[PDB]
Amino acid sequence: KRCLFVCRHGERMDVVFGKYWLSQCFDAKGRYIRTNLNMPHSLPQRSGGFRDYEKDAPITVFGCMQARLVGEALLESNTVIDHVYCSPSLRCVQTAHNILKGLQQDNHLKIRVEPGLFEWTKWVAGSTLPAWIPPSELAAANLSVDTTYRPHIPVSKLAISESYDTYINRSFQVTKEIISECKSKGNNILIVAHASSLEACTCQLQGLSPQNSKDFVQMVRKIPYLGFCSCEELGETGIWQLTDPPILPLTHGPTGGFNWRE
Amino acid sequence: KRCLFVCRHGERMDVVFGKYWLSQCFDAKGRYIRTNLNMPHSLPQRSGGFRDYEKDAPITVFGCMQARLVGEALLESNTVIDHVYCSPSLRCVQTAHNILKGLQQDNHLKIRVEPGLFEWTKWVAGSTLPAWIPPSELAAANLSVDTTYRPHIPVSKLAISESYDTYINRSFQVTKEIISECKSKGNNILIVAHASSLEACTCQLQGLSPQNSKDFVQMVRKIPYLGFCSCEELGETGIWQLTDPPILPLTHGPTG
């Protein structure tokens, strides 16, 4: 009885509202003016200005709902979570926070932001890695992160535009250190990250070799928001295996119709 | 200052989970077993059995969210609603109920189920009209309907597989009776219905003639869930006009 749950972040701003959503909710003075009910009542102050959101978008209001539902589902299934890690993307942090709410654990449990959980650095448009909000600015922004946590791969140890199996490796490496620094200290582990993280984090843990970098991207655009899978360790023999999740899947469609009229 | 707001129901079971969703959440004994987080924790007992849902699907959990958000939006904009009507489809009733929650009005205000607000009866698959839940069974199911309400077009006055401009007419007729039975009795009216209802209910109210039955269906698959539009009456001269809604639009994508 030990469990690793790995799930993807919830619905993301720049996908619904697309690349330039920033011009849709920030005026010239830098004030946030929501223009759609799927946009949160407020966004966190990024110490570098509203421009930093460009390479690190937040989740939408329905993004929170997805995550809440997952947390509540988890609580209904009496599934206890002991440690919760997430990627440093804001979207991931926010999804972890909101899972903790549904779980009714946001001010008992504390998210461990692990830059090693971040997605394959190829998908970072730009020459330069996102300006992530450091943990302590994140707590200050009402997210339940652990400022005490010392990362396994800190930011500076991340190569921009890195090799595919570099990404695969760090996933296996990070997940490995996570599983063991949580061993003496209670059962179930939750990781909140990216589409790629579902495969990458678990794959070699079950002794299976990764798909080469082409069939991968295929399987990555497969994964839904709050897409969720789980692993179980037999004995403490160190061998993990795939497992039916402890909660129902979550499917829903779009508001639909016309994105635009008149 | 009088307003008619007309909006479409929220996300619907049989579209997300498709035609046979019933076999996905009811076992042989007729017990509901949800198989997805977008499925409500429970469904209302239909006096005819779980089979009645087939021609009258409920809204999904994200269906409720959409509606709630609209209600809350309405409250934030300090927009007061005085009368709320809906189509008899369960999906419409449920959307109205959930708007009233966001609005914080569910046990002050009472939904008036109006069979005249129902969609063009062509889109009823089957030889026979849906087995709608009558108002009093609906209250009994925790929806804030008015059992006192006497409908303008009751169920029996609805033709199955009816004519297009029959549908257009009843829309104009029903909306007309709604606007006037609410006149002496306070300002804003909310109708919760169908995609077709947005055009059909308002169109001739502004003196515009309807699109013929081909360009219509085009404009009907246009309209989003909780799609929302509004009308304003100038003076009490009886002339209505199009107006910017009092609340932001709601757009979101799929889980994918």
Side-chain angles (χ1 to χ4, degrees), chain A residues 1 67 89 115 123 146 148 186 193 232:
Chain A
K1 82 281 309 188
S89 285
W123 301 322
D146 188 345
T148 263
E232 186 180 55

Short mmCIF file of all heavy atoms in Angstrom, two decimals, chain A residues 1 67 89 115 123 146 148 186 193 232:
data_model
loop_
_atom_site.label_atom_id
_atom_site.label_comp_id
_atom_site.label_asym_id
_atom_site.label_seq_id
_atom_site.Cartn_x
_atom_site.Cartn_y
_atom_site.Cartn_z
N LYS A 1 0.85 -1.23 0.00
CA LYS A 1 0.00 0.00 0.00
C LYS A 1 0.85 1.24 0.00
O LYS A 1 1.09 1.86 1.04
CB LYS A 1 -0.98 0.04 1.19
CG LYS A 1 -0.40 0.53 2.54
CD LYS A 1 0.41 -0.55 3.26
CE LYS A 1 -0.45 -1.82 3.35
NZ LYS A 1 0.14 -2.87 4.20
N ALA A 67 -10.07 20.87 -10.91
CA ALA A 67 -9.18 20.51 -9.86
C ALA A 67 -9.94 20.23 -8.55
O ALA A 67 -9.65 19.22 -7.87
CB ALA A 67 -8.18 21.58 -9.67
N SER A 89 5.35 25.44 -13.08
CA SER A 89 4.43 26.29 -13.87
C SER A 89 3.30 26.75 -12.95
O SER A 89 2.89 25.99 -12.02
CB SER A 89 3.85 25.58 -15.10
OG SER A 89 4.82 25.49 -16.13
N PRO A 115 11.14 21.92 -9.61
CA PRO A 115 11.47 22.31 -10.97
C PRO A 115 11.84 21.10 -11.83
O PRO A 115 11.67 21.15 -13.06
CB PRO A 115 12.66 23.25 -10.78
CG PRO A 115 12.44 23.83 -9.42
CD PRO A 115 11.96 22.67 -8.63
N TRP A 123 9.17 22.64 -25.47
CA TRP A 123 7.88 23.31 -25.59
C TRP A 123 7.84 24.71 -24.96
O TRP A 123 6.79 25.36 -24.88
CB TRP A 123 6.77 22.41 -25.04
CG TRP A 123 6.70 21.12 -25.76
CD1 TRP A 123 6.88 20.92 -27.09
CD2 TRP A 123 6.45 19.84 -25.19
NE1 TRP A 123 6.75 19.60 -27.39
CE2 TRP A 123 6.49 18.91 -26.24
CE3 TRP A 123 6.22 19.38 -23.88
CZ2 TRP A 123 6.30 17.54 -26.03
CZ3 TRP A 123 6.01 18.02 -23.68
CH2 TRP A 123 6.05 17.12 -24.76
N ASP A 146 5.21 24.83 0.03
CA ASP A 146 6.15 24.69 1.14
C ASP A 146 7.37 25.55 0.80
O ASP A 146 8.06 25.30 -0.19
CB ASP A 146 6.52 23.21 1.35
CG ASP A 146 7.34 22.97 2.60
OD1 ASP A 146 7.87 23.96 3.16
OD2 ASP A 146 7.47 21.79 3.04
N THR A 148 9.84 25.72 2.85
CA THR A 148 10.89 24.88 3.44
C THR A 148 11.52 23.90 2.44
O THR A 148 12.65 23.44 2.67
CB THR A 148 10.30 24.07 4.63
OG1 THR A 148 10.60 24.75 5.85
CG2 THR A 148 10.83 22.63 4.70
N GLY A 186 5.16 8.09 5.59
CA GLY A 186 3.76 7.90 5.17
C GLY A 186 3.53 7.48 3.72
O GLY A 186 4.43 7.57 2.89
N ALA A 193 1.35 17.85 -12.58
CA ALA A 193 2.29 18.40 -13.55
C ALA A 193 1.72 18.59 -14.96
O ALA A 193 0.73 19.30 -15.13
CB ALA A 193 3.57 17.59 -13.57
N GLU A 232 1.07 1.67 -7.94
CA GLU A 232 1.12 0.97 -6.65
C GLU A 232 2.44 0.22 -6.49
O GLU A 232 2.90 -0.43 -7.41
CB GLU A 232 -0.05 -0.01 -6.56
CG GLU A 232 -0.21 -0.70 -5.22
CD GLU A 232 -1.38 -1.67 -5.20
OE1 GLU A 232 -1.43 -2.56 -6.08
OE2 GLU A 232 -2.26 -1.52 -4.31
#
